């Protein structure tokens, strides 16, 4: 029938026509190593194929995307369904759109602020309402019964001019009544008029007081005035009342919002955009934002009536500041009106379903106004997880990245249950996740890339994960199932009371002003369920202050009082998964610092001696070293008439960003193109006489960059490998023990073996007399560190405090943190 999915012919990088058939509508995992090929095998190729198939079948634009995107690197793919990529691929990074808009609830914010918010004009606080003639005619009831008035049709309001001809025309129609400059005369015998003299021409139409059931004559003259007077009349207390119709404000005033319309409060749209920031929120905030990312008129004046929950009186910015939980609980129960209930029931249902899935993932501490940059990858990953589990399309295919980033252990287990829900839905699941518990908890597991780099990409194991245990060759299989594992260091480097960096007064956001101490020169790790605070505790305060002081920057100090520890460190250098550089001038080889070295060595070639090639001339940055047509990229770009772009290798450059003149020099029997393209593995093997570069390259190989090549582009390598090369380079940069620095979650996409390799690397960094604090939720980071601090019992409400600051074994003994609980479980 339809119960299995087959892929055949995965031939790319280390993948060698790798193939596999699996049971559709089950839970399946993809394991292996870093760079083992699973990344592209699952995301780049299989997801590309499925999405391309569905978009071509349906009418997505031209049914296409990237012109078939990648060519099919599978001899045959069968039994498929439209793939769904649950990945950290991308999000909404627009500064105009904050997480409030990204959460598909800015529309609902505007919906509520339209009518629930104060529907009143800013100028006079009068309920914004539009012009109507029916109210004009019905206003006769408002004016007391029997009170004299006049049927005054303002035909020509205040427009002065000698208009005896107009008098004659009005007679030609036939009314016999008129009033000019507020004085009545008969059209039969009107007064004289001059252009200089002001003439307020409101023609009397009929003789009437407030009578009973006089609507016949009333309407007769009244719609007449609504045309002649053009919509306006007055019933004065001639014995006051004005029978006028005005749009927007009833009094003809301007409005912050022209009416009760949600888009009026959309600064991403020009409705709410400031004159001086255009929705960006900057000029230093623009003078008309002052913290609120909205126009001051459209901040609260026309929308202060949001009676959400209790005491509800909110500005658009106020709801923005309402955290996830704050706004969700506010909207859980609120009384704004029956029509509002009818037209916002869908609003409540969408929001509550979204929040239920958000809790199913365990994500509330983020705020509606919280900067989208706070997305930790795992955050947006969980956003999409909730979206797709709520979608409920049964049988759809779903390929998962690793969402554990920014998550706790048993929280991740509960999320694993969340996905097993989708498995039970009949949906097909292919997984990728370093969490062990995720492993051993799937209907099927396929381990790949027996070797990590280009050398290994085959499916070393393919079974119920039992064949992973039976598959000893799978190094990751051995690491996970227990054939081998990382080890706890015998010695936890003792505290250093003298040189200790201690933050005091840290109350930024969730933080409760607690003070946190950290020894310097000995390894340390920080723990806490995501949302606890450590992230901004360091970034916004510790790292921010230390960096802008030691290096004289202007970073945000954060909410803190003081930070001791500066005197013990020569400087701070924040280092994280970031790349080396987006520009073409930034490439592995060039930006690793070996650029000038290779340039000089190539100048030292025998040919370069008989050629006089300057080292800077061996740079593509200068024109001499590069092909000017390529501008330093060694390729030809080809765009044509409304057709996709193509690229070709440049011939003079030979694809090396170095014209043939530069490439002719063949340092050590190798041109610049060669000494770029060869792998980092053979680079460490090579340059043996060159002490510095050889040490750098072998350090890179130890970090595990052998299969990568020095000549690769910067974009071609992941941020994890970028930090790998950065740590390898800084390894030989005279640490002196005082370069105590900071680090983020490094466990991203690392197999246990390379995890332990980097563990040894950081052990060396610590033995250098230094400490690079690490923000890692993982267990082994703590189990190997020698000082540990947990941000309160749990995240958010738990966070902003400390439960065990001291030794890793101290926190292990401490059960106040689940981190210490799992430590007690294992060491």
Q: Per CB under 8 A, does 8 bind a second copy?
A: no
From the list Zn ion, DNA, ligand ADP, none, pick the one residue 535 interacts with, judged by a Cβ distance below 5 to 8 Å according to partner type. ligand ADP
Does 563 carry a binding-site annotation?
Answer: no
Residue carrying structure tokens 């340092």? 667
Q: Per CB under 6 A, does 254 bind ligand ADP?
A: no
From the list a second copy, DNA, Zn ion, none, pick the one residue 251 interacts with, judged by a Cβ distance below 5 to 8 Å according to partner type. Zn ion
DSSP secondary structure code for residue 427 in this structure? -
Angle at 364 between CA 361 and CA 365, to 5 degrees: 130
What is the SS3 assignment for 568? helix
Q: Which of 332, 387, 621, 760 binds DNA (CB under 7 A)?
A: 621
Q: How far is the CB of 323 from ligand ADP (least distance, A)?
A: 7
Q: Which of 35, 37, 133, 737 binds a second copy (CB under 8 A)?
A: 133
Nearest to 780 by CA among 378, 433, 410, 436: 436
What residues from 622 to 661 belong to the interface with DNA (CB under 7 A)? 622
Size of the site for ligand ADP (CB under 6 A): 25
Q: Are 257 and 171 contacting, i.e. CB atoms less than 8 angstroms apart? A: no
Q: How far is the CB of 325 from a second copy (least distance, A)?
A: 25
Q: Per CB under 8 A, does 173 bind a second copy?
A: no
Does 463 carry a binding-site annotation?
Answer: no
Site string for a second copy, 259-298 (x = CB under 8 A): ----x-----xx-------x--------------------
Does 531 carry a binding-site annotation?
Answer: yes
Q: What is the 3-state secondary structure (H, E, C) of 328-394?
A: HHHHHCECCCHHHHHHHHHHHHHHHHHHHHHHHHCCCCCECCCCHHHCCCHHHHHHHHHHHHHHCCC
Write the CB contacts of 391 (distance below 8 Å, at least 6 apart in sequence).
none
Token code pair at residue 201? 């021409």
Give the interface segment with a second copy, choosing from 146-154, 316-324, 389-397, 776-784 (CB under 8 A). Answer: 389-397
Q: Per CB under 7 A, does 765 bind DNA?
A: no
Length of the chain: 827
From the list ligand ADP, DNA, a second copy, none, pick the one residue 394 interacts with, judged by a Cβ distance below 5 to 8 Å according to partner type. a second copy
From the list Zn ion, a second copy, ligand ADP, none, pick the one residue 528 interacts with, judged by a Cβ distance below 5 to 8 Å according to partner type. ligand ADP
From the list a second copy, Zn ion, ligand ADP, none, pick the one residue 69 interacts with, judged by a Cβ distance below 5 to 8 Å according to partner type. none
**Quick count: other Cβ atoms within 10 Å of Cβ 664?**
15
Q: How far is the CB of 174 from DNA (least distance, A)?
A: 20
Q: How far is CA 538 from CA 241, 801, 804, 819, in A?
A: 67, 14, 17, 19
Q: Are 792 and 528 contacting, i.e. CB atoms less than 8 angstroms apart? A: yes
From the list ligand ADP, Zn ion, a second copy, none, pick the one residue 133 interacts with, judged by a Cβ distance below 5 to 8 Å according to partner type. a second copy
Q: How far is the CB of 730 from DNA (least distance, A)?
A: 8
Does 528 carry a binding-site annotation?
Answer: yes
From the list Zn ion, a second copy, DNA, none, pick the one residue 387 interacts with, judged by a Cβ distance below 5 to 8 Å according to partner type. a second copy
Helices (H), 561-690: 588-591, 594-603, 606-609, 660-664, 672-677, 680-685
Nearest to 576 by CA among 723, 464, 709: 723
Q: Which of 17, 219, 353, 606 binds a second copy (CB under 8 A)?
A: 219
Distance CA 433, CA 480 (A): 12
Q: Which of 263, 585, 738, 821 binds DNA (CB under 7 A)?
A: 585
From the list a second copy, DNA, ligand ADP, none, pick the one residue 533 interacts with, judged by a Cβ distance below 5 to 8 Å according to partner type. ligand ADP
- Do the bridges between strand 27-31 and strand 233-235 make them parallel or antiparallel, or are there none, so unpaired? unpaired
Site string for ligand ADP, 503-542 (x = CB under 6 A): -----xxx-----------------xxxxxxxxx------
Does 32 carry a binding-site annotation?
Answer: yes
Q: How far is the CB of 139 from a second copy (least distance, A)?
A: 16
Nearest to 736 by CA among 520, 500, 442: 520
Q: How far is the CB of 732 from a second copy (least distance, A)?
A: 38
DSSP secondary structure code for residue 659 in this structure? -
Nearest to 721 by CA among 746, 753, 685, 689: 746
The residues pairing with 273 across neighbouring beta strands, listed in sequence order, are none
Q: Per CB under 8 A, does 345 bind a second copy?
A: no
Does 534 carry a binding-site annotation?
Answer: yes
From the list ligand ADP, a second copy, DNA, none, pick the one residue 510 interacts with, judged by a Cβ distance below 5 to 8 Å according to partner type. ligand ADP
Nearest to 180 by CA among 168, 163, 188: 163
Q: Per CB under 6 A, does 788 bind ligand ADP?
A: no
Distance CA 271, CA 153 (A): 36
Does 733 carry a binding-site annotation?
Answer: no
Does 485 carry a binding-site annotation?
Answer: no
What residues from 586 to 615 belong to the interface with DNA (CB under 7 A)? 586, 590-591, 593, 595-597, 599-601, 604, 614-615
Q: How far is CA 75 from CA 37, 391, 447, 460, in A?
A: 17, 32, 21, 20
Give the interface segment with DNA, choosing from 58-66, 428-436, 687-695, 770-778 (CB under 7 A). Answer: 687-695
Query: Residue 616: what are its φ and ψ, rounded to 5°?
Result: -60, -30
- Do the bridges between strand 76-78 and strand 635-640 make them parallel or antiparallel, or are there none, so unpaired? unpaired
Q: Per CB under 8 A, does 619 bind a second copy?
A: no
The residues pairing with 201 across neighbouring beta strands, listed in sequence order, are 156, 180
Rg (CA), the chain: 36
From the list DNA, Zn ion, a second copy, none, pick the one residue 690 interacts with, judged by a Cβ distance below 5 to 8 Å according to partner type. DNA
- Which residues contact Zn ion by CB under 5 A? 121, 123-124, 249, 251, 253, 274, 276-277, 286, 288-289, 627, 629-630, 650, 652-653
Does 38 carry a binding-site annotation?
Answer: yes
Site string for a second copy, 570-609 (x = CB under 8 A): ----------------------------------------
Write the CB contacts of 436 (distance below 8 Å, at least 6 apart in sequence).
480
Q: Per CB under 8 A, does 628 bind a second copy?
A: yes
Does 532 carry a binding-site annotation?
Answer: yes
**Quick count: other Cβ atoms within 10 Å of Cβ 667?**
22
Q: Is 784 exposed, middle or buried (0-12, 13-18, 19+ CB in 10 A)?
A: buried
Q: Which helix (H) or strand (E) holds 48?
A: helix 48-57
Q: Per CB under 8 A, does 426 bind a second copy?
A: yes
Cα 628 versus chain centre, distance? 38
Residue carrying structure tokens 């170095």? 658
Does 482 carry a binding-site annotation?
Answer: no
- Largest Cα separation within the chain, whole Å, is 118
Helices (H), 441-586: 466-469, 475-481, 534-536, 544-550
User: Based on CB atoms, which residue is closest to ligand ADP, 575 or 690?
Assistant: 575
Q: Per CB under 6 A, does 374 bind ligand ADP?
A: yes
Q: Find the helix packing angle between 594-603 and 691-703, rounded to 10°.
A: 140
Give the interface segment with a second copy, choosing from 29-37, 187-195, 466-474, 642-650 (CB under 8 A). Answer: 642-650
Q: Per CB under 8 A, does 61 bind a second copy?
A: yes
Q: How far is the CB of 536 from ligand ADP (least distance, A)?
A: 3
Contact set with a second copy (CB under 8 A): 1-2, 24-25, 51, 53-61, 65, 75, 78-85, 90, 107, 132-134, 219, 263, 269-270, 278, 346, 387-388, 391-396, 425-426, 628, 640-643, 646, 651-652, 661
The residues of the shown chain that bind ligand ADP, judged by CB under 6 A, are 365, 367, 370-371, 374, 376, 508-510, 528-536, 775, 791-792, 795-797, 799
Residues that constitute the known binding site for ATP: 32-39, 528-535
């Amino acid at each position: 029938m339809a119960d299995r999915l087959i892929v055949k012919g995965a031939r790319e990088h280390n993948l060698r026509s790798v193939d596999l058939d699996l049971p559709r509508d089950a839970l399946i995992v993809f394991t292996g190593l870093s760079g083992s090929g699973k990344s592209s095998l699952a995301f780049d190729t299989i997801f590309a194929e499925g999405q391309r198939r569905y978009v071509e079948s349906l009418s997505a634009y031209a049914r296409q995307f990237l012109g078939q995107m990648d060519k099919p690197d599978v001899d045959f793919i069968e039994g498929l369904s439209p793939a769904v990529s649950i990945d950290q691929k991308s999000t909404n990074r627009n500064p105009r759109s904050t997480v409030g808009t990204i959460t598909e609830v800015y529309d609902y914010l505007r919906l509520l602020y339209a009518r629930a918010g104060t529907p009143h004009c800013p100028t006079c606080g009068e309920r914004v309402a539009r012009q109507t003639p029916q109210q004009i005619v019905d206003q006769v009831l408002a004016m007391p019964e029997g009170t004299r008035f006049l049927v005054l049709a303002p035909v020509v309001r205040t427009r002065k001019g000698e208009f005896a001809d107009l008098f004659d025309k009005l007679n030609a129609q036939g009314y016999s009544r008129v009033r000019v400059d507020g004085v009545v005369h008969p059209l039969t015998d009107p007064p004289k008029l001059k252009k200089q003299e002001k003439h307020d021409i409101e023609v009397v139409v009929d003789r009437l007081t407030v009578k009973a059931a006089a609507k016949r004559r009333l309407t007769d003259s009244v719609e007449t005035a609504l045309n002649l007077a053009d919509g306006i009349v007055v019933l004065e207390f001639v014995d006051e009342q004005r029978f006028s119709e005005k749009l927007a404000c009833p009094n003809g005033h301007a409005l912050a919002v022209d009416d009760l319309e949600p888009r009026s409060f959309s600064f991403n749209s020009p409705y709410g955009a400031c004159p001086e920031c255009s929705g960006l929120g900057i000029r230093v905030p623009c003078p008309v934002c002052a913290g609120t990312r909205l126009k001051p008129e459209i901040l609260a004046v026309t929308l202060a009536g949001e009676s959400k929950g209790e005491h509800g009186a909110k500005s658009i910015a106020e709801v923005c500041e309402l955290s996830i939980a704050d706004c969700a609980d506010f909207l859980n129960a609120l009384t704004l009106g029956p029509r509002e209930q009818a037209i916002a029931g869908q609003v409540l249902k969408e929001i509550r379903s979204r929040l239920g899935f958000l809790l199913d993932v365990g994500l509330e501490y983020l705020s509606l106004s919280r900067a989208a940059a706070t997305l930790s990858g795992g955050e947006a990953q969980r956003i999409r997880l909730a979206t797709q589990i709520g979608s409920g399309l049964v049988g759809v295919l779903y390929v998962l990245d690793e969402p554990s980033i920014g998550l706790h252990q048993r929280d991740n287990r509960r999320l694993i249950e969340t996905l097993t829900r989708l498995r039970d839905l009949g949906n097909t699941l292919i997984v990728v996740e370093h969490d062990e518990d995720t492993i051993e908890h799937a209907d099927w597991i396929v381990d790949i890339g027996p070797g990590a780099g280009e050398h290994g990409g085959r499916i070393v194991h393919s079974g119920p994960y039992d064949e992973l245990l039976r598959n000893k060759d799978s190094i990751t299989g051995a690491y996970l199932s227990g054939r081998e594992s990382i080890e706890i260091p015998a010695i936890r480097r003792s505290v250093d009371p003298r040189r200790q960096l201690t933050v005091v007064g840290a109350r930024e956001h969730n933080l409760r002003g607690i003070d946190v101490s950290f020894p310097l020169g000995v390894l340390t790790s920080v723990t806490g369920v995501s949302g606890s605070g450590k992230s901004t505790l360091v970034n916004d305060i510790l790292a921010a202050v230390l960096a802008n002081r030691l290096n004289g920057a202007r970073q945000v100090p954060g909410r803190h009082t003081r930070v001791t520890g500066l005197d013990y460190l020569d400087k701070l250098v924040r280092v994280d998964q970031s790349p080396i550089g987006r520009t073409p001038r930034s490439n592995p080889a060039t930006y690793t610092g070996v650029f000038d070295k290779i340039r000089t060595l190539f100048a030292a070639t025998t040919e370069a001696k008989v050629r006089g090639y300057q080292p800077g001339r061996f740079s593509f940055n200068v024109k001499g070293g590069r092909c000017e047509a390529c501008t330093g990229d060694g390729t030809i770009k080809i765009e044509m008439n409304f057709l996709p772009d193509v690229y070709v290798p440049c011939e003079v450059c030979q694809g090396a960003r170095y014209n043939r003149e530069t490439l002719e020099v063949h340092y050590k029997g190798k041109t610049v193109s060669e000494v770029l393209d060869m792998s980092i593995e053979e680079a460490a093997e090579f340059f043996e006489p060159i002490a510095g570069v050889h040490r750098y390259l072998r350090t890179l190989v130890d970090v595990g960059l052998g299969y990568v090549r020095l000549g690769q582009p910067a974009p071609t390598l992941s941020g994890g490998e970028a930090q790998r090369v950065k740590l390898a380079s800084e390894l030989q940069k005279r640490s002196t023990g005082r370069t105590v620095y900071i680090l983020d979650e490094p466990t991203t996409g690392l197999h246990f073996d390379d995890i332990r390799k980097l563990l040894n690397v950081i052990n060396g960094l610590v033995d250098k007399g230094n400490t690079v604090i690490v923000i890692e939720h993982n267990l082994d980071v703590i189990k190997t560190s020698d000082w540990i601090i947990d941000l309160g019992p749990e995240g958010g409400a738990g966070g902003g405090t400390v439960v065990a600051q001291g030794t890793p074994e101290d926190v292990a003994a401490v059960p106040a943190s689940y981190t210490g609980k799992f430590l007690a479980e294992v060491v």
